[PDB]
Write an enzyme that holds these catalytic residues in place. Sequence first.
Site, PDB file in Angstrom:
ATOM      1  N   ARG A 153       0.202   0.885  15.500  1.00 53.85           N
ATOM      2  CA  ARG A 153       0.091   0.730  14.034  1.00 53.85           C
ATOM      3  C   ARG A 153       0.629  -0.659  13.643  1.00 53.85           C
ATOM      4  O   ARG A 153       1.270  -1.373  14.453  1.00 53.85           O
ATOM      5  CB  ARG A 153       0.792   1.895  13.334  1.00 53.85           C
ATOM      6  CG  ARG A 153       2.290   1.911  13.517  1.00 53.85           C
ATOM      7  CD  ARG A 153       2.922   3.172  12.912  1.00 53.85           C
ATOM      8  NE  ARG A 153       3.032   3.137  11.467  1.00 53.85           N
ATOM      9  CZ  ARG A 153       3.823   3.933  10.768  1.00 53.85           C
ATOM     10  NH1 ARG A 153       4.515   4.892  11.363  1.00 53.85           N
ATOM     11  NH2 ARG A 153       3.930   3.761   9.464  1.00 53.85           N
ATOM     12  N   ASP A 174      11.303  21.783 -24.959  1.00 51.94           N
ATOM     13  CA  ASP A 174      11.169  20.446 -24.341  1.00 51.94           C
ATOM     14  C   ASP A 174      11.999  20.460 -23.053  1.00 51.94           C
ATOM     15  O   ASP A 174      12.428  21.537 -22.639  1.00 51.94           O
ATOM     16  CB  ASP A 174      11.557  19.301 -25.277  1.00 51.94           C
ATOM     17  CG  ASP A 174      10.758  18.025 -24.961  1.00 51.94           C
ATOM     18  OD1 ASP A 174      11.202  17.258 -24.079  1.00 51.94           O
ATOM     19  OD2 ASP A 174       9.663  17.819 -25.557  1.00 51.94           O
ATOM     20  N   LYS A 229       3.885  30.027   4.080  1.00 49.07           N
ATOM     21  CA  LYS A 229       3.161  29.610   2.861  1.00 49.07           C
ATOM     22  C   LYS A 229       1.660  29.586   3.153  1.00 49.07           C
ATOM     23  O   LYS A 229       0.911  30.030   2.326  1.00 49.07           O
ATOM     24  CB  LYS A 229       3.666  28.260   2.354  1.00 49.07           C
ATOM     25  CG  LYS A 229       5.148  28.278   2.039  1.00 49.07           C
ATOM     26  CD  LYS A 229       5.647  27.061   1.224  1.00 49.07           C
ATOM     27  CE  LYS A 229       5.051  26.958  -0.168  1.00 49.07           C
ATOM     28  NZ  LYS A 229       5.382  28.150  -0.987  1.00 49.07           N
ATOM     29  N   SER A 271      -0.301  26.981  -5.017  1.00 47.44           N
ATOM     30  CA  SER A 271      -0.020  28.421  -5.223  1.00 47.44           C
ATOM     31  C   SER A 271      -0.664  28.844  -6.551  1.00 47.44           C
ATOM     32  O   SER A 271      -1.294  29.918  -6.585  1.00 47.44           O
ATOM     33  CB  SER A 271       1.453  28.710  -5.201  1.00 47.44           C
ATOM     34  OG  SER A 271       1.979  28.606  -3.903  1.00 47.44           O
ATOM     35  N   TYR A 317       8.957  15.605   2.175  1.00 46.98           N
ATOM     36  CA  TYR A 317       8.914  16.989   1.619  1.00 46.98           C
ATOM     37  C   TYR A 317       8.870  16.908   0.072  1.00 46.98           C
ATOM     38  O   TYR A 317       8.145  17.674  -0.554  1.00 46.98           O
ATOM     39  CB  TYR A 317      10.035  17.852   2.195  1.00 46.98           C
ATOM     40  CG  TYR A 317       9.800  18.057   3.668  1.00 46.98           C
ATOM     41  CD1 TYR A 317       8.849  18.949   4.128  1.00 46.98           C
ATOM     42  CD2 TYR A 317      10.430  17.233   4.598  1.00 46.98           C
ATOM     43  CE1 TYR A 317       8.529  19.010   5.492  1.00 46.98           C
ATOM     44  CE2 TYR A 317      10.177  17.308   5.946  1.00 46.98           C
ATOM     45  CZ  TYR A 317       9.210  18.211   6.398  1.00 46.98           C
ATOM     46  OH  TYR A 317       8.916  18.266   7.745  1.00 46.98           O
ATOM     47  N   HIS A 354       0.851  -1.214   0.000  1.00 42.17           N
ATOM     48  CA  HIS A 354       0.000   0.000   0.000  1.00 42.17           C
ATOM     49  C   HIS A 354       0.874   1.247   0.000  1.00 42.17           C
ATOM     50  O   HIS A 354       0.699   2.142  -0.889  1.00 42.17           O
ATOM     51  CB  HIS A 354      -0.947  -0.015   1.197  1.00 42.17           C
ATOM     52  CG  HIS A 354      -1.566   1.307   1.475  1.00 42.17           C
ATOM     53  ND1 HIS A 354      -2.432   1.940   0.572  1.00 42.17           N
ATOM     54  CD2 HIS A 354      -1.442   2.124   2.551  1.00 42.17           C
ATOM     55  CE1 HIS A 354      -2.816   3.088   1.108  1.00 42.17           C
ATOM     56  NE2 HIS A 354      -2.237   3.223   2.319  1.00 42.17           N
ATOM     57  N   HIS A 385      13.901  12.217  14.198  1.00 36.55           N
ATOM     58  CA  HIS A 385      12.561  12.242  14.850  1.00 36.55           C
ATOM     59  C   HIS A 385      11.760  10.980  14.481  1.00 36.55           C
ATOM     60  O   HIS A 385      10.701  10.760  15.100  1.00 36.55           O
ATOM     61  CB  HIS A 385      11.794  13.541  14.597  1.00 36.55           C
ATOM     62  CG  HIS A 385      11.388  13.804  13.178  1.00 36.55           C
ATOM     63  ND1 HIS A 385      11.499  15.062  12.636  1.00 36.55           N
ATOM     64  CD2 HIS A 385      10.843  13.008  12.225  1.00 36.55           C
ATOM     65  CE1 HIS A 385      11.021  15.041  11.413  1.00 36.55           C
ATOM     66  NE2 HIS A 385      10.631  13.779  11.111  1.00 36.55           N
ATOM     67  N   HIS A 386      12.245  10.159  13.538  1.00 33.17           N
ATOM     68  CA  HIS A 386      11.655   8.829  13.251  1.00 33.17           C
ATOM     69  C   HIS A 386      12.277   7.760  14.163  1.00 33.17           C
ATOM     70  O   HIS A 386      11.947   6.602  13.970  1.00 33.17           O
ATOM     71  CB  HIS A 386      11.872   8.475  11.788  1.00 33.17           C
ATOM     72  CG  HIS A 386      11.150   9.415  10.884  1.00 33.17           C
ATOM     73  ND1 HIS A 386       9.814   9.255  10.552  1.00 33.17           N
ATOM     74  CD2 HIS A 386      11.575  10.559  10.277  1.00 33.17           C
ATOM     75  CE1 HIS A 386       9.452  10.297   9.789  1.00 33.17           C
ATOM     76  NE2 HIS A 386      10.523  11.048   9.592  1.00 33.17           N
ATOM     77  N   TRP A 429       7.028  -0.357   4.966  1.00 36.94           N
ATOM     78  CA  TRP A 429       7.724   0.303   3.832  1.00 36.94           C
ATOM     79  C   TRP A 429       9.127   0.781   4.233  1.00 36.94           C
ATOM     80  O   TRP A 429       9.913   1.110   3.326  1.00 36.94           O
ATOM     81  CB  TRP A 429       6.852   1.418   3.263  1.00 36.94           C
ATOM     82  CG  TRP A 429       6.979   2.740   3.967  1.00 36.94           C
ATOM     83  CD1 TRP A 429       6.437   3.101   5.165  1.00 36.94           C
ATOM     84  CD2 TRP A 429       7.684   3.886   3.497  1.00 36.94           C
ATOM     85  NE1 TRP A 429       6.752   4.401   5.478  1.00 36.94           N
ATOM     86  CE2 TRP A 429       7.514   4.915   4.455  1.00 36.94           C
ATOM     87  CE3 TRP A 429       8.429   4.155   2.344  1.00 36.94           C
ATOM     88  CZ2 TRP A 429       8.107   6.173   4.310  1.00 36.94           C
ATOM     89  CZ3 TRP A 429       8.987   5.397   2.205  1.00 36.94           C
ATOM     90  CH2 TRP A 429       8.811   6.399   3.160  1.00 36.94           C
ATOM     91  N   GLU A 489      12.170  12.669   1.632  1.00 30.52           N
ATOM     92  CA  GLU A 489      11.104  12.067   0.801  1.00 30.52           C
ATOM     93  C   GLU A 489       9.722  12.679   1.141  1.00 30.52           C
ATOM     94  O   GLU A 489       8.904  12.895   0.210  1.00 30.52           O
ATOM     95  CB  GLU A 489      11.152  10.545   0.894  1.00 30.52           C
ATOM     96  CG  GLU A 489      10.062   9.880   0.151  1.00 30.52           C
ATOM     97  CD  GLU A 489       9.994  10.085  -1.362  1.00 30.52           C
ATOM     98  OE1 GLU A 489       8.901   9.787  -1.949  1.00 30.52           O
ATOM     99  OE2 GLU A 489      11.026  10.472  -1.917  1.00 30.52           O
ATOM    100  N   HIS A 534      12.952  11.431   5.456  1.00 29.87           N
ATOM    101  CA  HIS A 534      12.406  12.774   5.795  1.00 29.87           C
ATOM    102  C   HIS A 534      12.402  13.663   4.524  1.00 29.87           C
ATOM    103  O   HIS A 534      11.338  14.143   4.102  1.00 29.87           O
ATOM    104  CB  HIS A 534      12.981  13.457   7.040  1.00 29.87           C
ATOM    105  CG  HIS A 534      12.051  14.599   7.235  1.00 29.87           C
ATOM    106  ND1 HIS A 534      10.815  14.481   7.891  1.00 29.87           N
ATOM    107  CD2 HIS A 534      11.985  15.749   6.554  1.00 29.87           C
ATOM    108  CE1 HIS A 534      10.127  15.569   7.696  1.00 29.87           C
ATOM    109  NE2 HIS A 534      10.801  16.338   6.828  1.00 29.87           N
ATOM    110  N   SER A 547      15.132   6.093 -11.783  1.00 32.00           N
ATOM    111  CA  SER A 547      14.140   6.857 -12.556  1.00 32.00           C
ATOM    112  C   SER A 547      14.119   8.295 -12.007  1.00 32.00           C
ATOM    113  O   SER A 547      14.230   9.258 -12.782  1.00 32.00           O
ATOM    114  CB  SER A 547      12.774   6.220 -12.470  1.00 32.00           C
ATOM    115  OG  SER A 547      11.806   7.107 -12.989  1.00 32.00           O
ATOM    116  N   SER A 548      13.973   8.449 -10.687  1.00 26.16           N
ATOM    117  CA  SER A 548      13.807   9.784 -10.053  1.00 26.16           C
ATOM    118  C   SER A 548      15.134  10.546 -10.046  1.00 26.16           C
ATOM    119  O   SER A 548      15.089  11.769 -10.175  1.00 26.16           O
ATOM    120  CB  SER A 548      13.244   9.650  -8.657  1.00 26.16           C
ATOM    121  OG  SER A 548      11.870   9.410  -8.709  1.00 26.16           O
ATOM    122  N   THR A 589       6.773  27.040   6.802  1.00 25.23           N
ATOM    123  CA  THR A 589       5.487  26.428   6.386  1.00 25.23           C
ATOM    124  C   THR A 589       4.334  27.420   6.654  1.00 25.23           C
ATOM    125  O   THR A 589       3.448  27.547   5.800  1.00 25.23           O
ATOM    126  CB  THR A 589       5.264  25.031   6.980  1.00 25.23           C
ATOM    127  OG1 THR A 589       6.460  24.266   6.815  1.00 25.23           O
ATOM    128  CG2 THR A 589       4.107  24.363   6.280  1.00 25.23           C
TER     129      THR A 589
END
EC number: 7.1.1.9
Lengths: 44, 40, 513, 72, 258, 227, 75, 56, 91
Positions: free
Chosen positions: C438, C91, C319, C255, C244, C61, C290-291, C126, C242, C240, C156-157, C316
């Site tokens: 969890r 392009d 924004k 925006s 963001y 998931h 913090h994880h 995950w 990731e 972390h 890829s990324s 944050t």
Amino acid sequence: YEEGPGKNIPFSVENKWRLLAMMTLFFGSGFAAPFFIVRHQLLK
Amino acid sequence: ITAKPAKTPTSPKEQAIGLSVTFLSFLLPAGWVLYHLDNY
Amino acid sequence: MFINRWLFSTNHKDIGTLYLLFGAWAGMVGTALSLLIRAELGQPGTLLGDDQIYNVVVTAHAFVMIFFMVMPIMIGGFGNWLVPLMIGAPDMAFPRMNNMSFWLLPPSFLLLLASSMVEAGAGTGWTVYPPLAGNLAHAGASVDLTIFSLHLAGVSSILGAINFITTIINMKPPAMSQYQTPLFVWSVMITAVLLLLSLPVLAAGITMLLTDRNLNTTFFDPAGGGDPILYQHLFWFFGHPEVYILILPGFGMISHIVTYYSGKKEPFGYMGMVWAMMSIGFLGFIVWAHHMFTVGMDVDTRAYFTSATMIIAIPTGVKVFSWLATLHGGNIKWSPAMMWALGFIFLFTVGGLTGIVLANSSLDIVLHDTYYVVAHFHYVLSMGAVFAIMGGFVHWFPLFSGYTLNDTWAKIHFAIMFVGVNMTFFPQHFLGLSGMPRRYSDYPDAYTMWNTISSMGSFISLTAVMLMVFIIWEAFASKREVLTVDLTTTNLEWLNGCPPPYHTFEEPTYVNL
Amino acid sequence: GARTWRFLTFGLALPSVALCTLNSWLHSGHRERPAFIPYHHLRIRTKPFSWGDGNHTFFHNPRVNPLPTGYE
Amino acid sequence: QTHAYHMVNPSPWPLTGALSALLMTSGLTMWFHFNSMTLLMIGLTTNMLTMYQWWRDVIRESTFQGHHTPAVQKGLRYGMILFIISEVLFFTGFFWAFYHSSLAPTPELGGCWPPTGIHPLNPLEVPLLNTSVLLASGVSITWAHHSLMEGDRKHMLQALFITITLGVYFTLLQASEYYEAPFTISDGVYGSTFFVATGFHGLHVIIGSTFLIVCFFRQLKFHFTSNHHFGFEAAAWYWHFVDVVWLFLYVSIYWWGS
Amino acid sequence: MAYPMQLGFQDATSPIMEELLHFHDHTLMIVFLISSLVLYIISLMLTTKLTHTSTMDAQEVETIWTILPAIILILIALPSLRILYMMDEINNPSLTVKTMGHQWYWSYEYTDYEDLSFDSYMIPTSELKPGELRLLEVDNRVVLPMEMTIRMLVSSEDVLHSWAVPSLGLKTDAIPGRLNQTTLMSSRPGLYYGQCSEICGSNHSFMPIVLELVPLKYFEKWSASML
Amino acid sequence: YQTAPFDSRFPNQNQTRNCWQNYLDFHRCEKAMTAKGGDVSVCEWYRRVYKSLCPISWVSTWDDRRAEGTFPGKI
Amino acid sequence: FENRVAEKQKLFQEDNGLPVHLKGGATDNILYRVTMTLCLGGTLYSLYCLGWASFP
Amino acid sequence: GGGVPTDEEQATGLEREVMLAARKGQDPYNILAPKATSGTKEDPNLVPSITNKRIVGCICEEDNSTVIWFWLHKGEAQRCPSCGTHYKLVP
Ligand code: HEA
Ligand code: HEA
Ligand SMILES: CCCCC/C=C/C/C=C/C/C=C/C/C=C\CCCC(=O)O[C@H](COC(=O)CCCCCCCCCCCCCCCCC)COP(=O)(O)OCCN
Ligand SMILES: CCCCCC/C=C/CCCCCCCCCC(=O)O[C@H](COC(=O)CCCCCCCCCCCCCCC)COP(=O)(O)OC[C@@H](O)CO
Ligand SMILES: CCCCCC/C=C\CCCCCCCCCC(=O)O[C@H](COC(=O)CCCCCCCCCCCCCCC)COP(=O)(O)OC[C@@H](O)CO
Ligand SMILES: CCCCCCCCCCO[C@@H]1O[C@H](CO)[C@@H](O[C@H]2O[C@H](CO)[C@@H](O)[C@H](O)[C@H]2O)[C@H](O)[C@H]1O
Ligand SMILES: CCCCCCCCCCO[C@@H]1O[C@H](CO)[C@@H](O[C@H]2O[C@H](CO)[C@@H](O)[C@H](O)[C@H]2O)[C@H](O)[C@H]1O
Ligand SMILES: CCCCCCCCCCO[C@@H]1O[C@H](CO)[C@@H](O[C@H]2O[C@H](CO)[C@@H](O)[C@H](O)[C@H]2O)[C@H](O)[C@H]1O
Ligand SMILES: C[C@H](CCC(=O)O)[C@H]1CC[C@H]2[C@@H]3[C@H](O)C[C@@H]4C[C@H](O)CC[C@]4(C)[C@H]3C[C@H](O)[C@]12C
Ligand code: CUA
Ligand SMILES: [Ca+2]
Ligand SMILES: [Zn+2]
């Protein structure tokens, strides 16, 4: 290459009912897959 | 946004068909698996 | 001609279209997995009769929603479609390498679905922490296929990040400085820098896990002098950044949508929006532990990670307040896209605030590995990313397709989805505070009522997904071709028509100094 | 200029390599292998290797690399 | 067009490259689990065919067709710098693993670094020679660059040949070290950090050497002008990256870690 | 333990859990206010026909938008870090107990004086005595003295686990090759429940923790009986 | 003696090295007191502390390794 | 060796409509067919391997 | 010590066209930012095109982050809808 609405996609929108079949197979295959994977694991 | 009139208008009846087929494409296969979970 | 166009593409729009189709399919897979999770948790006792299968479903998931739905849609789809158009570029910098970033994803996805089909799957979470993910506790090919899926997604990324950074730096009109590029383009540039720096560290970490599993290395094995906690540092040093990465292009799309439907020529406080995204990107690299507040780190380390984490609230908040100040004084158009964006600002704010609760290590002792965390990230990530994607999709659908949506249907879709996600996730706060862990296939009886309500909410969101497919069908079925769109003077992506020709900006824009 | 970098190549860099080659080739003789001790943090076997008999490392040297059970 | 950018012909190599990645990964899986090398050898073959034809096409587009305007070349410069940055962060993860293990050696190791029973290589023997070799190759590749800029074919080829020779020497020295090493990849976290970090570096030396050899043959075929030779610049940047990673390995693993 | 329809934390059993309750109440008031202010302001921006669409100067308002949140974060961090440094302060424990995680049960070792050890397994649903709790009971509870500072040491003999007791404010990961320390102090006798809190495979949901808190004299009698 | 007291050398959550140091100290002392036929009562503090802190399986593994000649610490 | 770049410029600029990957002539076709056949055949083989590995 | 070709000898295709146009002070491939005139009706910004319309972006004031985009058509000069600066297409 063909330009313009309905022509810049890898699927045809010439016929709305053929389109409905293709979209059903497309999204339905994705949605079904996990149910069939769970069945496959349970059947082991 | 403004648009031309629909080239191929989709009537209420046509929408009821499209929506019904869409819902069934999601519900029937998952339904079959969940209904037969016991049998697995 | 079909194979040349769709398998051999060197065109940013067609590759964007492939990414959107890929991401939409992935979203169906990820949604089906989410409904299986909630079917198990919908009643106490066991449904699947196989808690290893439950764990595999939860793991898949997450991977599907993050790597195959959000990132392909936001960066591959909206990024490839909009970035070149918004800077008048003909392009991407590397139009052929672009196509390989796309074609790596179907094989990546095939490896993930192979992981779940061989042996008993990867029931790891995950995070894929050893030793559960090692060759004793997960013997066989499933975890190796998961590691390889992530290697292909990673390449890829990384290549896509190189393409976007180069395009955005090098391919603007010569008069256009970085401070005259639209915020969506900034949001993609910053996301690409985070990808470029974070994904190689993940690649190092999962490669170590691969060698521990297959070449008798002991990076994470105390018997050889290794440490399971080293894996967690490497994973979260990526992880972390990731989270963001998952939201930043969403911030960019919000925006543009808020500005457009407020009838404004420009977002409030442009340079503050750029500052805020760059600040979030930078702070995003110095907070990862913090994880790990429950793994036994030193008190001063916990104090540092609490403080650094809370700092992210400042840029944050700029924004959030800037979006509100863009609404301020607007001639508001209550379009479906605007509804998605307003839903985003509220739901994102709720999830960001539960993040600030979790930042406090002391409280995190009690909230870590509970449904409070699951509630936090399904607000900020699941609803944030999804609502930004849906807002962008209904806003730019007529640009990409040349056809209009039925706005009433689109509003119905928004209303159902808003009820469903809140009914699903709001009660998980109570489950977390009251101590429901969890990653559980079953729960003590006390937790039944909120799990029942949460599962009922999940079906409401299913109804919204099915309706979304119908709405897309109806637009292509009816063929209402776009005539005019307002505010083209501040939305360059629209100025070549709907859809734009295969080649745009063959003659570049004229911009003087 | 090219002339300067060629001067550094032949006048500094390759002479350095020649001197390190001489240094290495002076200390190239085989060291006496240490007694075998079956330490549990070494000769790790959590899964057979995907080659040979599964128990030999990829560049196994019989003279200096004992197996878990000792020198061949 | 009245812009200076390159609209690339539709190409099969992205799809063949993506499929080569599927075959190499499914191939590694089938080697590690199902005792078979077949998929892996097909994947390695198709990967090499894909890289050959893709980079051939880039040479066709630039040297033969003239598509690399200054704007295109500036793009490729950014692309190669960003690629090198991604490779630096990949190595950073291995250095992090090394320092984590060595700075806090666990009881299983004897609570010391190197661990009980590990007899490190003398860093003043072959590892020092390897250092002199890669530093020397950084000097020779700079001589090659200046020779090319000055229009000197013969001295560019001699300098580049010397650079490649030093790269090959490093690779043969490291192969010999590997065989002579009394510790293995299975010798706990010492062997793990040593062989995976130096092994990925040796892979990058082979890649870098192969890139320089491609530049050597292009130079033999007069592809490079005194002003336009980005493939040479990219190979030089990559080569300097390989040197710098070696210096960090040498100081960290071979010297400080002994 | 949790009870049906519970909204908040389990009642505090330790002084540090009490502190966390007060700290959460403080932080939740702030979360509520900020959430509410954002919703309200959205509604205010959306409910007027009045317009201002020309360029707006952002410099003055951005001072408010950075300073006020900075102050709020400091007002959260101060009490946050006070509690963090309290749950670190040197105490004299009078007892050390080890717990080792396994797939899927806990073992306990009381080795200050005698080598006392035992396994603690979940009571299967089919074996629960009337009125006993599904998924929460164990065969052998962790008997501990109340109103005394106890050192818990946590490790694993296989994969990661995590030893948690929400009502005492406790969660410490169980990592093989590592001995993690936490302090336990119960203000009250009774039974205090927790659950494995790091995913450890198929039976992660099914390896609970039950503490049995009794007066010292009863703890000593129980220790003595174990001989 | 009730339990092992706070040790300023090992003030953090990770107590692995506290267990290890006291096991080493006990065994180094025991070997010193036997190597003059001395008296192992001198080693008692280290014994109580490692017995209090160390997991039984760690103590048992280390003991087996000392007997095998594979203990990697210096005694 | 002699500088034959001008002759390769003429070949690769010929107005024959070929994409750059095929513009060298018949050898390019052969190498493309080998590469694509190995990739597609390899991919079909990988699916068979998945089918095999999905069951005991 | 020679034998390396020069760009003058060996550059081809678009690279060569860019190289030859730069020698003549011409910018047919839009590499340079054009310098604004006063932008009055008497002194309009002259916008080259190969066709009968071109997109203009107007940075109305230095350091504006907002660019104003519109199609400039052949014929009478058109004005930026934000600042009123005049632009005239010169096929
Ligand atoms: C982007 C990330 C994302 C998204 C969207 C979601 C969506 C959902 N998630 Fe979850 N989830 C995670 C990321 C996400 N999730 C992660 C990371 C975990 C942790 C795994 C672990 O513990 O290891 C997790 C775990 C998690 C759990 C905890 C399981 C456990 O701990 O045992 C639950 C429980 O209810 C849950 C439920 C859901 C539900 C019901 C949805 C959805 O049903 C909610 C509604 C959303 C949709 C239906 C998506 C709609 C979008 C599309 C269909 C795309 C359309 C495309 C176009 C328009 C182009 N997920
Ligand atoms: C979109 C993705 C996303 C985003 C953007 C965030 C944003 C934040 N997250 Fe979240 N997070 C996740 C996705 C995300 N997170 C996921 C997936 C996990 C779980 C991983 C796993 O275990 O599977 C997670 C887990 C996670 C943890 C670990 C908890 C645990 O496991 O015990 C923590 C700890 O601090 C954290 C905190 C934060 C903070 C402080 C922010 C901040 O960036 C939020 C800042 C925003 C605001 C504060 C709101 C707007 C601000 C204002 C209106 C100004 C005024 C505010 C104040 C003065 C407070 N999150
Ligand atoms: C001479 C200098 C350089 C030589 C290069 C190496 C030659 C053979 C293999 C090449 C690939 C190497 C790259 C790094 C991977 C892992 C191990 C490599 C290091 C190496 O060669 O180590 C050897 C072991 O190799 C082993 O196990 C087996 C090695 C073969 C199997 C490796 C398979 C793993 C592949 C991992 C893929 C990950 C790719 C990352 C992609 C990331 C993208 C984001 C050491 O020999 P030993 O006998 O233990 O000790 C010597 C005793 N006398
Ligand atoms: C037995 C062997 C085993 C090892 C196999 C593994 C791979 C080895 C591959 C080695 C890399 C070879 C790269 C050759 C590139 C040739 C094309 C080239 O160099 O193309 C140049 C452009 O550069 C460009 O695209 C720049 C292109 C940059 C390519 C960078 C490549 C680095 C590749 C790294 C691979 C990933 C490694 C990760 C491992 C974990 C062309 O422009 P110019 O040179 O200016 O010419 C034009 C003038 O003539 C005009 O006057
Ligand atoms: C366990 C095993 C799993 C591994 C799977 C391996 C993954 C995929 C298979 C790889 C196949 C590669 C085939 C060659 C790709 C060459 C790309 C290239 O060289 O791309 C260039 C751009 O990138 C540039 O320069 C700079 C970038 C050059 C990058 C070269 C490719 C690197 C691939 C792997 C690296 C990952 C990074 C390692 C750090 C994590 C050229 O761009 P194009 O759009 O083509 O042309 C533009 C035209 O103007 C040129 O005339
Ligand atoms: C997670 C999201 C899922 C949401 C649930 C979907 C809602 C249910 C959809 C209907 O699904 C069907 O349900 C029928 C039962 O009503 C099943 O027929 C089954 O039962 C019938 C009557 O009992 C028999 O005639 C059939 O043979 C038998 O297969 C049938 O297979 C299945 O397709
Ligand atoms: C036109 C395209 C043609 C495609 C042909 C593919 C080329 C390879 C075909 C043969 O396949 C091989 O069969 C061997 C057995 O017959 C395997 O032995 C492998 O397994 C052995 C087991 O004894 C081990 O020693 C080694 O891993 C290894 O030799 C080997 O791995 C495997 O590749
Ligand atoms: C052009 C497209 C390319 C198409 C690909 C062609 C596929 C070739 C089919 C050959 O299949 C092989 O059969 C071997 C013998 O049946 C297996 O040997 C292996 O499996 C044997 C099982 O008996 C063991 O003895 C050994 O591990 C080993 O020899 C091996 O796994 C497998 O690959
Ligand atoms: C004779 C030939 C001329 C090349 C030319 O101008 O076409 C020369 C010029 C530079 C020469 C190369 C350089 O001197 C460097 C190498 C010297 C070695 O002794 C032989 C191989 C070596 C790689 C040479 C091969 C060949 O003799 C080259 C290529
Ligand atoms: Cu043990 Cu979870
Ligand atoms: Ca259930
Ligand atoms: Zn203007």
